[PDB]
């Protein structure tokens, strides 16, 4: 009935139009060490975050899942500022991006238990002293592999999901390990109706998707607008793939997002001009002003789109 | 003539008795993500740090190099608190512990330049807004290898040393890559009189040490008290090895320390009883109350010990 947001418990029936995967802040692990040239501008960042939020609100978005990992600059108090300003629901995550802190604890023998303990504290007690609980557990695997280290988190996550009924959301690397992630989680008693396999758009083969869908998990095409980088496919290939699945009747299992980074942590940078032009549509409005349109031209009805944007998040969190 | 400390420039001739490698705070990268169960207790930590400092002061220690990497909880303002309290000189570092933040910048093409730029800013301008400059560049290599990623830092470091005359201090993993580190740095124009190859005590073969010494670099036996873990040797093996070198007349090239972690960042823990007893002498007084004694029984004169503790740091920083 309720999900934890950065503003406390919210009835699931009120989440409405939802983006399943967007980052207000994000930094790659290691950004912390580059503090001197990469200082966090809090009032400017807040401004950008608020803008991004209003943009979503313009297209009816009432709720956003921000799955920024604990080691990637997750900042629940800052996200609470955004929500307090805009009235946007924001659900944050507990999890790590895809050693040696946990490598050390593996030596101690307590690593998997420590991770489970972290997930439980952050799901049921609160993150640091923010009084904010995460609503999702965030997981990530490597290219072509779910490593022993990663499986620790997958096992801790499954155990925490049993206890809390929390949602698991995952990162797949370069369109691999979708079926493996779903199978491994189910092995350990996770509930498929509470799992989103992420970055599934990274793979263009519909068989791979169906293989994953057969587990009864949600899949996310959540990188709309990312092109020419991280071995990613084109938006055209995304739509093609998404079209095969929808025509095949899979709409109760699919959600869409952009995986935007609205504020980058660490040292500012500028993408080179080959990369730069390709990434031009990577922003929180893209789904609504480009993708959803082309989908309609391909005959996707509104009941379906609503299933993805409203029905599916509502099923997922309830 | 001067070195930058956490309290500003200090004449090198006043550094006096010096420990070349000790950590007031340290956390393994990733500790940041474990904030909920691993919150930093600032006033308690300060208390412990101050105690540790006074302990060093009891044995005449006037100066300490704290080479905690940027991504391991380096906190210059906190170290400045310690120095202001105790009058201890503390020299801090710029560097990273032994991706994907810098992996990403490698993609951008700016990684090595960004690292050099960081070293220059932190050596000559200041760390974040603390107004503290690092006095050393800290480097680290992997077991049996200096990876392409690591060489980036080694190259950036050599370039920064040319410009600034700063000291380089290194981490070797499990007694490997000593000669390789010295050779690679010298290749790129680094000054051997400004280089300390660290953790050299990790290797028990005196030939390996002599091989490294032949470059004219300093070597550090800086893990006195660490036993039974990290593939480490015994203190007895350390002393044996150190004895061969001193008898061979190498005292102008050797320094000693414990590589202590006085406050651990991240989640508290307790070492298991096998490990625990092994590690019992791992504290900042060990050199002075156990090692230096046994050295005298083996006939090490005080002129020599002074060369290591006073003359060598004085040569190194001048
Ligand atoms: Fe993401
Ligand atoms: Fe160290
Ligand atoms: O991501
Ligand atoms: O270390
Ligand atoms: Zn991801
Ligand atoms: Zn080290």
The answer to whether residues B97 and B169 touch, using CB atoms and an 8 Å cutoff, is: no
The answer to whether residues B36 and B212 touch, using CB atoms and an 8 Å cutoff, is: no
Q: What's the CA gap between B25 and B79, in Å, rounded?
A: 9
Q: What's the CA gap between A13 and A3, in Å, rounded?
A: 10
Question: In a 10 Å sphere around its CB, with 0-12 CB exposed, 13-18 middle and 19+ buried, how is residue B273 labelled?
Answer: exposed
The answer to whether residues B184 and B141 touch, using CB atoms and an 8 Å cutoff, is: no
Q: What's the CA gap between B83 and B87, in Å, rounded?
A: 5
List all residues 6 or more positions away from A60 whose beta carbon is below 8 Å from its beta carbon.
Answer: A16, A17
What are A90's strand-pairing partners?
A64
User: Tokens 């990290």 belong to which residue?
Assistant: B230
Chain breaks in chain A (C to N over 2.5 A) after: 98
Contact B29 A27 (CB under 8 A): no
Q: What's the CA gap between A280 and B52, in Å, rounded?
A: 54
CA–centroid distance for A162 within its chain: 20
Q: What's the CA gap between B287 and B298, in Å, rounded?
A: 15
CA–centroid distance for B252 within its chain: 18
Chain breaks in chain B (C to N over 2.5 A) after: 98
How was it solved? Answer: X-ray
Closest CA to B260 of B39, B33, B61: B61
Closest CA to B115 of A36, A100, A73: A36
Return phi, psi of residue A110, to 5°.
-115, 5
Contact A104 B272 (CB under 8 A): no
Task: Write down all domains in chain A, each with its CATH number in brackets.
Answer: 1-318 (3.20.20.140)
Per the structure block, which two tokens stand in for A57? 């609100």
Q: What's the CA gap between A117 and B281, in Å, rounded?
A: 32
The protein residue with its alpha carbon nearest to ligand 3, atom 1, reads A259
The answer to whether residues B312 and B19 touch, using CB atoms and an 8 Å cutoff, is: no
What are B153's strand-pairing partners?
none
* A271 vs B contacts (CB less than 8 Å): 108
CA–centroid distance for B261 within its chain: 11
Mutate to test the interface with A, among B25, B74, B101 (most CBs of A within 10 A): B101
Q: What's the CA gap between B190 and B169, in Å, rounded?
A: 12
The answer to whether residues B32 and B117 touch, using CB atoms and an 8 Å cutoff, is: no
Peptide bond into A63 cis (omega under 30): no
Q: Kindly write down the DSSP assignment for every residue of B193-227, as one continuous string.
A: GGEEE--GGG---HHHHHHHHTTT-EEEE--TT--
- A187 vs chain B: nearest CA distance in angstroms? 27
* B101 vs A contacts (CB less than 8 Å): 27-31, 33-34, 266
Q: Kindly write down the DSSP assignment for every residue of A169-233, as one continuous string.
A: EEE-STT--HHHHHHHHHHTT--GGGEEE--GGG---HHHHHHHHTTT-EEEE--TT--SSTT--
Give Rg (Cα) of chain A.
18
Q: Write the Ramachandran bin of A15: left for phi over 0, alpha for psi from -120 to 50, otherwise beta.
A: alpha
Resolution in A: 2.1
């Amino acid at each position: 009935e309720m999900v934890e947001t950065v503003c406390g418990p919210v009835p699931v029936e009120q989440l409405g139009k939802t983006l399943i995967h967007e980052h207000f802040l994000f930094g790659y692990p290691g950004f912390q060490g580059d503090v001197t040239r990469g200082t966090f501008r809090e009032d400017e960042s807040l401004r950008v975050a608020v803008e991004a939020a209003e943009k979503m609100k313009r297209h009816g978005i009432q709720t956003v899942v921000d799955p920024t990992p604990n080691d990637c600059g997750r900042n629940p108090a800052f996200l609470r500022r955004v929500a307090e300003e805009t009235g946007l629901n924001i659900i944050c995550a507990t999890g790590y991006y895809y050693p040696p802190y946990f490598q050390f604890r593996r030596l101690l023998g307590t690593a998997e238990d420590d991770i489970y303990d972290m997930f439980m504290a952050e799901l049921t007690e609160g993150i640091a002293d923010t009084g904010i609980k995460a609503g999702v557990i965030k997981l990530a695997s490597s290219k072509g592999r779910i490593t022993e280290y990663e499986k620790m988190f997958f096992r801790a996550a499954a155990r925490a999901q049993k206890e809390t009924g929390a949602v698991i959301i995952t990162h797949t690397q370069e369109g691999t390990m979708g079926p493996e992630q779903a199978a491994y989680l189910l092995e350990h008693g996770a509930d498929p109706k509470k799992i989103v396999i992420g970055h599934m758009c990274g793979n263009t083969d519909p068989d791979y998707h169906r293989k994953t869908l057969a587990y009864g998990v949600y899949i996310a095409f959540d990188r709309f607008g990312i092109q020419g980088m991280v071995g990613a496919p084109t938006d055209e290939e995304r739509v093609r793939t998404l079209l095969a699945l929808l025509r095949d009747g899979y709409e109760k299992q699919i959600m869409l997002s952009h995986d935007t980074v609205n504020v980058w942590l660490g040292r500012p940078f500028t993408l080179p001009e080959p990369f730069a032009e390709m990434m031009k549509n990577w922003h929180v409005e893209h789904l609504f002003v480009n993708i959803i349109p082309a989908l309609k031209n391909e005959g996707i009805r509104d009941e379906v789109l609503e299933q993805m944007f409203i029905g599916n998040p509502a099923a997922l969190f309830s």
